[PDB]
A paper describes a structure:
To gain insight into the mechanism of [name], we determined 2.3 and 2.1 Å X-ray structures of [name] [name] with the cofactor SAM and with the SAM-mimicking inhibitor sinefungin. The crystal structures of [name] [name] bound to the cofactor SAM or to the inhibitor sinefungin contain two dimers of [name] in an asymmetric unit, with two cofactors bound to each [name] dimer. Because the two cofactors adopt similar conformations, we focus our discussion on the structure bound to SAM.
In bacteria, uridine 1915 of the 23S rRNA undergoes two steps of post-transcriptional modification—pseudouridylation, followed by N3-methylation—that convert it to 3-methylpseudouridine (m3Ψ). [name] acts on the assembled 70S ribosome. [name] consists of five parallel β-strands (β2-β1-β4-β3-β5) sandwiched between two layers of α-helices: α2 and α4 on the solvent side, and α1, α5 and α3 on the dimerization interface. Our data suggest that [name] [name] functions as a dimer, with the SAM binding pocket of one monomer and the C-terminal residues of its counterpart forming a composite active site.
Author numbering:
A (entry chain D), B (entry chain C): -1 to 155
Write the structure that this text describes.
């Protein structure tokens, strides 16, 4: 009937130029496929901090936010989908019908539980990208994919 | 003995938030290794226009701009360097000493001449990225690679 694309991400307070771009893609998604952002609190890093405990804590909050959604992690070693392939996946997610949680890890990455829960995993790049740009890249690529499905003018290059 | 990184891009309109992001990274490159933008005016797609001819004209100009430089194309089918490899490429480019021209194609992509002129081709993603994001990604990823080489904090933030 409609499928929410929900970005579940660690971190807060992105640079304005980033927040602006991200918002520009976000507001162009149609009402029958809304794109939304859920931010998970980043664990307090520091000296003598237990990284592993923090990752686990972040993961548990992310899994709580995904609920019974399709879970797709953004991970460098995931599937290197090209744009036609992503359009196909979006169609797949539509047929599935469950809202989609797209998980983006914090500074230290995704918890093992999050990687285990993934139904699919998606690689944007072989590069190590900074979290804010990952947010913008997910918004645009999915928008482009959406447009291909609806024969919208943005994708015709 | 500084080495120049010249982004040779088919001239395009950049949204303000993209322009801000792009300059933010660009501004942080050392005098040791300058990051530079050189736009090539995009041809107009008139009625009945022969696309192939339009493209060649775009390319010839790119190559004229590249000159004697090492020519690296940004192309989806190119080498999907990870961030470690990109730092290693950066080191190779320095040993060369020769300036690098990094080519970004117009709406129709790179001219066959540009693709042929390439000593190396570099893929950011399997995805079809919009021209302005390609600029920001190149600036940030090259910055991250450089950061590694000098043990600058950015890479290890
Ligand atoms: N190439 C990529 N493809 C898909 N997801 C990515 C990619 N790079 C980073 N991510 C996501 O971004 C998250 C990690 C980023 N916060 C990495 C920044 C980290 N602080 C560092 O210094 O590089 C990872 O958990 C992934 O979920
Ligand atoms: N994933 C990528 N990796 C490297 N360069 C890219 C990538 N995506 C886009 N570009 C650059 O952006 C330019 C314009 C592209 N939108 C052209 C699209 C491409 N001709 C296609 O149909 O998939 C291309 O000529 C490339 O130089």
């Amino acid at each position: 009937h409609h499928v929410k694309l929900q970005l579940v991400a660690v971190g807060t307070k992105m640079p304005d130029w980033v927040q602006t771009g991200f918002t520009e893609y976000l507001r162009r998604f149609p009402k029958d496929m809304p794109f939304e952002l859920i931010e998970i609190p980043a664990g307090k890093r520091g000296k003598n901090a237990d990284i592993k405990r923090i990752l686990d804590k972040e993961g548990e909050q992310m899994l709580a936010a995904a609920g019974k959604n399709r879970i797709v992690t953004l991970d460098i070693p995931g599937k290197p989908w090209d744009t036609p392939q992503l359009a196909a996946e979006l169609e797949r997610w539509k047929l599935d019908g469950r809202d989609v949680s797209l998980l983006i890890g914090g500074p230290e990455g995704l918890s093992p539980a999050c990687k285990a829960a993934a139904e699919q995993s998606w690689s944007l790049s072989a590069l190590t990208l900074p979290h804010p740009l990952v947010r913008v890249l997910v918004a645009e690529s999915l928008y482009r994919a959406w447009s291909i499905t609806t024969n919208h003018p943005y994708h015709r290059e």
